[PDB]
């Protein structure tokens, strides 16, 4: 006859459980005691009801565990296991963090870069806003000429990378042009790529005479 005790604290030294949303989370609190103690789980210090999350949750007395499948952001919080018998009660609280992960090519915000107009001698900027889980690589490209032509015999347009992401580059998301000339007018493209794929959107620079 004895009050509850832990049988395996090693599996309880993790102070933070961070998991990808949609994955399954499992919490355990191996316990002992005589009579055999009973287990109950609390969420944020209060009774954890099956209706508190869609799809509810499952417990396994054989393993003193709580299982939640397809976790969603709202599952974040503190999960307390309470083990007890007539001689006493003990508990342990785990904290759960949920993060949305995405394996997708970069997504650009609609409307950016936005068109711009300035006079000869003026300055302008183009902005690109990106959503990307995998680290994105940004490059600004202009559609240029060669031998007077804007396209090659293979139909490919002549392109020139004005700048791109890197430790030697400041502010990759913004292309700033200074003391512009009518020769600067044209299409400026923001092409963003991660190992999964790419996306691109462009804008037009209009350059008016100084007059």
């Amino acid at each position: 006859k004895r009050a509850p005790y832990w049988t395996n604290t090693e599996k309880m030294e993790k102070r933070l459980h961070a998991v990808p949303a949609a994955n399954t989370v499992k919490f355990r609190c191996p316990a002992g005691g005589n009579p055999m103690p009973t287990m109950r789980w609390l969420k944020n210090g209060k009774e954890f009801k099956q209706e508190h999350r869609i799809g509810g949750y499952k417990v396994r007395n054989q393993h003193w565990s709580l299982i939640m499948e397809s976790v969603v952001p709202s599952d974040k919080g503190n999960y307390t296991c309470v083990v007890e018998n007539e001689y006493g009660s003990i508990n342990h609280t785990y904290h759960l963090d949920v993060v949305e992960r995405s394996r997708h090519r970069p997504i650009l915000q609609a409307g950016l870069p936005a068109n711009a107009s300035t006079v000869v001698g003026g300055d302008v900027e183009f902005v690109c806003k990106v959503y990307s889980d995998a680290q994105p690589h940004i490059q600004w490209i202009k559609h240029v000429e060669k031998n007077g032509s804007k396209y090659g015999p293979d139909g490919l347009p002549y392109l020139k990378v004005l700048k791109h992401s890197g430790i030697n580059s400041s502010n990759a998301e913004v292309l700033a042009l200074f003391n512009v000339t009518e020769a600067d007018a044209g299409e400026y493209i923001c092409k963003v790529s991660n190992y999964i794929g790419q996306a691109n959107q462009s804008a037009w620079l209009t350059v008016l005479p100084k007059q």
């Binding site: 030294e13 993790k14 102070r15 933070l16 459980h17 961070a18 998991v19 990808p20 949303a21 949609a22 994955n23 869609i54 969603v72 952001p73 709202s74 974040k76 963090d97 949920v98 993060v99 949305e100 992960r101 394996r103 915000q109 806003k129 990106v130 959503y131 990307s132 889980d133 995998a134 680290q135 994105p136 690589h137 992401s165 890197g166 430790i167 998301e173 790529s193 991660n194 190992y195």
Partner: protein, 145 residues
């Protein structure tokens, strides 16, 4: 519902400082000032805030915002903090099946040497890692919950 669930993720989120949380023991990757690398469960630790950036498509630098040191792996497969960026600081960032990230040394990609953290919080050695350990699974987290 899925429509009610809220969770930040604004444009440019990829450039904000992150913590590289290892699910193995639940440690945050840490780059100490003296150049050593290990893990810690102290989310308030000032040497776990990292700035990730793609130097080349799918190739990233992992830099300590606190000391400016770059994470790197030597020819022995050991992690260390480098004051200056070099070829040993580049890692191939990829998302695995269970949606955790793995980071493989670009320099030693052919050998599949990953960045990893053992349950005791100490850095794993490149040669001792492989596609299946929990030690190589990472989750980039916001600095604060």
């Amino acid at each position: 519902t899925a429509l009610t669930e809220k969770f930040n993720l604004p444009p440019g989120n990829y450039k904000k400082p992150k913590l590289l949380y290892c699910s193995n023991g639940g440690h945050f990757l840490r780059i100490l000032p003296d150049g050593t690398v290990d893990g810690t469960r102290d989310r308030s630790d000032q040497h776990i805030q990292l700035q990730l950036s793609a130097e080349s498509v799918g190739e990233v630098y992992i830099k300590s915002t606190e000391t400016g040191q770059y994470l790197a792996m030597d020819t022995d497969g050991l992690l260390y903090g480098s004051q200056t960026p070099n070829e040993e600081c580049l890692f191939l960032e990829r998302l695995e099946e269970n949606h955790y990230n793995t980071y493989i040394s670009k320099k030693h990609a052919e050998k599949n040497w990953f960045v990893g953290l053992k349950k005791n919080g100490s850095c794993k050695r490149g040669p001792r890692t492989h596609y299946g350990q929990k030690a190589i699974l990472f989750l980039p987290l916001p600095v604060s919950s």
